[PDB]
Amino acid sequence: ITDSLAVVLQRRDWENPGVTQLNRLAAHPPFASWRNSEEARTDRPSQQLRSLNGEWRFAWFPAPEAVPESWLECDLPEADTVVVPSNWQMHGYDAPIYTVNPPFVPTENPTGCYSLTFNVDESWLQEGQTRIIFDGVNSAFHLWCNGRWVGYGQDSRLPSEFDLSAFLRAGENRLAVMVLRWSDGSYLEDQDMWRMSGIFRDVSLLHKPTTQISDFHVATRFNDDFSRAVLEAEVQMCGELRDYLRVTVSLWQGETQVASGTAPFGGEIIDERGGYADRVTLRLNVENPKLWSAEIPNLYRAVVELHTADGTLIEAEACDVGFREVRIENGLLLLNGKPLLIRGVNRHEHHPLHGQVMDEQTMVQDILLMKQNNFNAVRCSHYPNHPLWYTLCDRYGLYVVDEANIETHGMVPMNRLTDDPRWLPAMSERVTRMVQRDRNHPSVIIWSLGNESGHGANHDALYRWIKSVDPSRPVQYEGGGADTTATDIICPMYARVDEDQPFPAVPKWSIKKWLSLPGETRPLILCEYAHAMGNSLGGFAKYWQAFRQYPRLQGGFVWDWVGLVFADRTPHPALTEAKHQQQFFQFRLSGQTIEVTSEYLFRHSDNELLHWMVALDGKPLASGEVPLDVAPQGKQLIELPELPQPESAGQLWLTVRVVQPNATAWSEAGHISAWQQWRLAENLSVTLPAASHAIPHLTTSEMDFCIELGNKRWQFNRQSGFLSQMWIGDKKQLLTPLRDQFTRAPLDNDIGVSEATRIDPNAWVERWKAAGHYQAEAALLQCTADTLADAVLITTAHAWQHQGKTLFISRKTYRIDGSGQMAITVDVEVASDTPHPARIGLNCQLAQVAERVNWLGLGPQENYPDRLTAACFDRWDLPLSDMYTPYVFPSENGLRCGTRELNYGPHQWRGDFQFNISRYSQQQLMETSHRHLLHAEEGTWLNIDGFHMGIGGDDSWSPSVSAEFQLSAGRYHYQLVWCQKG
Amino acid sequence: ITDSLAVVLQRRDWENPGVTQLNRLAAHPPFASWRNSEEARTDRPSQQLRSLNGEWRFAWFPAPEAVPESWLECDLPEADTVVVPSNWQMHGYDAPIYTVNPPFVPTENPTGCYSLTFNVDESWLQEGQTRIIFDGVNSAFHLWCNGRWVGYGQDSRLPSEFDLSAFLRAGENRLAVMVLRWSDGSYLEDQDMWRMSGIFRDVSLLHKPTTQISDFHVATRFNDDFSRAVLEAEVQMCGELRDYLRVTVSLWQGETQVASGTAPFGGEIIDERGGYADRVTLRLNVENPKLWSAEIPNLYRAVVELHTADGTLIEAEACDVGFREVRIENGLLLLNGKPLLIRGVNRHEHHPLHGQVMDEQTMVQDILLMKQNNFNAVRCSHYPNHPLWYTLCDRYGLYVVDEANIETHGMVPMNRLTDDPRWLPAMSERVTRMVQRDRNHPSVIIWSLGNESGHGANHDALYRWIKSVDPSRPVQYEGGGADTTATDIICPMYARVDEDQPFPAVPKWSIKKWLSLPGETRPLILCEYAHAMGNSLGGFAKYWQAFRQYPRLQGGFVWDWVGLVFADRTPHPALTEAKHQQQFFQFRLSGQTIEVTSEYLFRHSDNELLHWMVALDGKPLASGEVPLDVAPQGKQLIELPELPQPESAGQLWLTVRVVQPNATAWSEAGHISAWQQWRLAENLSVTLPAASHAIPHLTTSEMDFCIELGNKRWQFNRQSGFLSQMWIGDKKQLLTPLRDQFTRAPLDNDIGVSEATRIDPNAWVERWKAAGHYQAEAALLQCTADTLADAVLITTAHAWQHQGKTLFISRKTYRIDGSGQMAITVDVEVASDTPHPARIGLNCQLAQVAERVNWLGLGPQENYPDRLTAACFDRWDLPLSDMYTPYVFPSENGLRCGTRELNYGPHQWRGDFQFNISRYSQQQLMETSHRHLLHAEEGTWLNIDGFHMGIGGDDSWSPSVSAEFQLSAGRYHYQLVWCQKG
């Protein structure tokens, strides 16, 4: 018959771009088919919407033709049981893939055969229409019901609905879904993530009446000052048209109705032939509406009731309504008349352990974490999301960019399909069905045409379709240079603040220059910036300085939320930097006055308290709390009381922080939302050290210099020229000699795309390797020891040469005084023609392992020269475990900058340096592929650097360390004092 | 198997809007696959392009499921033989139709099964790709080759091509085409004509090499003054890419090459991923190019050769190239920098006797007739035309509007499908494949999105697609009010010159007012105006007065070329009016000076001669010829010699005409292209008639008045009050008494859409019938006879009453003098509340039938008060057959206006009147449905009117007779003199 696999699979609908669906129902906003207005208003579960999620039978096959014909009737004997909302690659069937014939797919196409046996109540079959909704099926699938072919579908990221009324029998039924891994639709979903396949979203049964609401959308119009609003709702019905049918739309704020409207069907005159008989538009007037924003997500409940003129209800639908206006005026993106500043992040749908299956708890966890880190916007990264995601963004407050599932970055012209009219029907379905589904969500403020697909005529056609259908939202699209005619917003990927990248035919201008190009009037919001891969996000403060200064630079979306957090949602150190740069309160210090400027556009600071503190080298001296009363975009001047003026040496530090005393929906009581630190006044130390009576004693041999003072003793290797050992009592303190270090375990930004096959000569790590920085051998030039009147002077000079070329010269002085202290002064010369070294400092392996690391310096978290703004100067005490950052691919990590004193066990290091301390050496971090293969070493590895190169972050494939953070001075000096507990 | 009818027809692809084709090749410009550059240059026939037109086997079936499975293998025994380029309704299978479930079609779907057995040479199968091209198949079809299913297609008006390489066997082959009458595509082709179905266009086989030219298009760029041009050709290839492949584009003017370019494959960098490896763009520089226009169609020959680097040719393609620029600047449509004035006409593809099958001879005949009537543009009425049509328009010179095959006027909202995104894929295919086929034709200057489909978002999306793909042509679309965002040109249908028609949501403003609406800057060109149905085209001069005066009124397209001509291409009388109003020479008379203004934009009057003539009441007095030397848009002042000044009574008339002494490609030597007439000087007649010695003798009875003079004698019925009989000798002259006439056989404009079921009360004929004008009975009020000193005076007064209401009163005076003459003075009163009568005059049936009709008056052709500008005053002699216009639906016809003297047999009528003379009475014309049922009556029916109502023409469904041409004065006077040959 024609329901058999041989007939159904003969036309190869998954290799035809002209066939994207068969017998699929129209797209629409979510429906629950409530038979009670009160249940619809309160969003209670509907008995007409039944979930088929649960245990299904599954069978895997190498190709679609390998599926036996008997599968259509009975479950296979070897078929196992799975939970249907899952990806079958997570169950170990074929290898998951993270990574051409444009219409055709390989013949070896893995096929997943799902089947479910379920019961249907006879009430559903007597009357009304029963449909099945597949929220997401990766690639393409064929559907059977009781052995009869139903339909076909593609576009994995949007729901596919089929009418099952003629197929369901009273009693037991069986569904058979044949999911294919690859189809012609895979060419439009060719992005960079775990590919995965299966029924990765919800499957449900919906029962609608014979006469039903088929579609509805709402529009909000406002007067000049937003004091009056009109809510227009257009309702479309399907089925038999009767003169006694009525539609009522009611607006509810909580439990009080604020507007209502009723009308029979029959719309306004459209054109010569007339108007829609099956449509009605209701206009509802709202006085002083509560506006929706990310700061204050005021939501109403709109209930759409289809009922008879007498008063009997047929069906009820409901949605949340937010009152807001989004438009671009004079080159600025305005929300409710105010210029938005986007604190955005890109977010893929990635479950911590279930792959691509999203659930409510993970979504709420993600939203809370974003808002607690001062994010106000999220970009739906390259496909429409789970329907519940948009509902949660309405309720908590998050601007959402909704993106069509179009991505063809693998094409060699990259517009080969988007400039081909034969692929226009395929791409139009992906754009139109997204708009039809999500147009009612207030959180969605921008439409996105897709990602990395070049620029073709299809983009222009689909851009104009959205503008015609929904003029209430701007349309953005990166592709073809991010400033084509198919975008209302210049949305470059990884454009830099000041440096231009003039690629042929698609230049990446600096964002400041991009704005002022001749004829350019649009606002600029970066769809992707600040690549957070590994130890990254250096120079993040540069972007937000530019965002504040330039009105038409209206923010951007940080790439990869999850990323800024690990898979278990543990935060990266760079998340703190993003939170600080994205604060809604800016601070200015002038004498004893603190000026607080609010960056909120709508809300008043009614849950805000300012706590200020003055400390001297980590010792608190005074503190106070002042309530915050700042209007949106206003300023509050706060006069500090008479601050302490200690006569002890040290630097005075003033720290302010904004604390929320009350808990919100997204934060708990005591939440810190903003902070800032300043230097107040420094008293330079002029006091001399105590006149120690003792003198260190120097012994000289042919192999070493030995300095002895009491129980302490130092040993310098005369052949190597480095301090080899130190003894307190009879206990050795070192396992590895203290030597100069000029390299670091390469970061992901240092490596770039330089694989072992496609080498990248411009990468930092390749230049360091070609210059011999990792292979340079130290050579001793001179080593002398002299006894002073109160100390012992050790002078050494080393040269680091690679293949007959001196790369670095280090001249070091060791001064061991009678008090036990050890002063180390280092002077380093770097050749100008060699690439700038990653660091200039010392390293050693301490024999002792200790539990706590105490230091007076910047930040509790790891920080780097270009990622230290969020860090604060104070006295920090952390366990040694927290001094190591567990990046997936091991690299240099755990650095703390601006440190004046470091304590570890009995050792104290004083000066002006950066340090990282851990159990893994830089050598081991360089050679270990994954962090689970890292093993702790015998002692503790300490890296103390006078100077350290910045980290990248503008992108991960090209060098992005700014010139002011490169070690290009040529000559460097730093001093260190090493003392003990005495 | 799956090639069987049961499997193929099971999915019902013709009821699915998402399936418009299966296995169809991409659209492209016409290809011949020449294997020789010289043959391509000279457009010789190619042996690689083989025509399958000829004798096929045909079988008709009521439904697709009625076709037996055996048809796929062998020809049916009862199948007859037909010529394949035909419509099967023309062979009498199902009734042709001239005149909803939006996706579904009726189950009774007539099916035409075509089959052909043909031979294939082995040379085609050993190497290369063999394809079959179906230029047009109405609705949808399935294709089989040797019993194997090939593909499916829709969009009747564009070619469908399929690859047959894997299906053809060496030797004899069989093709089976299953043509369905209705499909889902019929909803987009729901226009108003003979529906018809079958393979109505050419079927051919094309053989291309393994590596072939897959697509190419040319673009012309110009400097400011068009003295320098660049010809850019982008060539795309299909197949295996080799480094030794080359593409050469050469430009030829006649037999001399003027430009050439060669390059290997590999285009310019498009975006980040690179450029097209299978594309190459060649730039050719042309100095002082010969520009293309409708006036001077200068054509070049571009030859595209695909060849090896050594020099061996693989394949050659060619096309004609015209150098012209079309753009809209400051609200004006410019061609080569000059504002166009469109003398356009709508043209359907209608063969004189083969229905919808077009052949070259009919196309050339149509083009010649258009250009000979001063038309310069043609609108492809609602679908793409035969490919040869566009080639002929390039060569002869005609601006072409190419229209996509989208027409949904039957939808109740009329945008129900064009606002539905589910129908966007269907409509996009109809637009994109037309542009891909015809974008290289210079004659095509405007794209049209379709006809009468409302305005939806799909229109906006498809409008922007064309602008992106081909920015060299404007895009126009009537629908949604003719001024939406989906059109670059305001293109109303049947908008009036001065009167506004404010329909709800789609007003039809007057064209003068439409231009000056707030915010309106676009030019206005009427896509449809001056409905030529029946006796029509009244007020045509009003449109062309407005076209000349207003710069942004740039012409329009007259509806229905064929229409302006009959099916046999016999011209209508209204065609002369169109030719005169569309003249390219305008004339002004000032004293003895004629000012001639040229309306040509590019050409000089180098084939023009002005012949002037002065006549006195049709008697020539002087004549002369002056050569024309007028620059484009210039003026030539022509001083006439001393004109004759006759002292005889009468009016002097000056007639000028432009004659082309040399034959052109579209006209023969002696062609008249323009003319104009003026009144020069009138000498009023003051001489008295000769003093006749005789006196007519009056006899009075109770039944009649009898006047006798010599052999002549008149008889007046005293009961009726009308002249009943006149005798010359003993021969009666009348069969019907001379009576007042106030009605005419209703024109098509008089009837409107007033059917016997849906009555239209506003129609002119319905108001006349409701007022009783056709049923009014004359009542005699008074009738007296008096003998004068030299004449006999007869006075009558009649009243025409209908249901106790006097409609008209006629007071008539008869003065029979002694010379034999009969002076008739008529005074008529018309009630102000009754609708204005169609005419005011007399009628009678003369007993004599004569061969020639001689009159001194306006025009040789029939003319009416608002369609008389093209007519000329002179002495005309025509046979009685030419005095009748054979309209398909009989109506009032044959009127000649401005007549001072009419001669028919021995009778002469003098005065100032209009007349029509024929063998059919107005009563018979009103009751006869079709002209083939008209039968001549016993004598000759003469209608002499002092006054006559104008004819409509702005549209055919609403009253369109202007107020200045209605008979609204209330009181009317006219005089007539009736004499004989004595």
From Swiss-Prot, chains A, B:
Query: Per its Swiss-Prot or TrEMBL entry, what cofactor is needed?
Result: Mg(2+); Mn(2+); Na(+)
The reply on keyword Metal-binding is: yes
Q: What is the effect of changing residue 957 to F/G/L/T?
A: Decreases affinity for substrate
Q: What class of enzyme is it?
A: hydrolase
Site positions for Transition state stabilizer: 348, 382
Record text on subunit structure and interactions:
Homotetramer.
In its UniProt entry, what is this protein called?
Beta-galactosidase
The organism's taxonomic lineage, starting at the top: Bacteria, Pseudomonadati, Pseudomonadota, Gammaproteobacteria, Enterobacterales
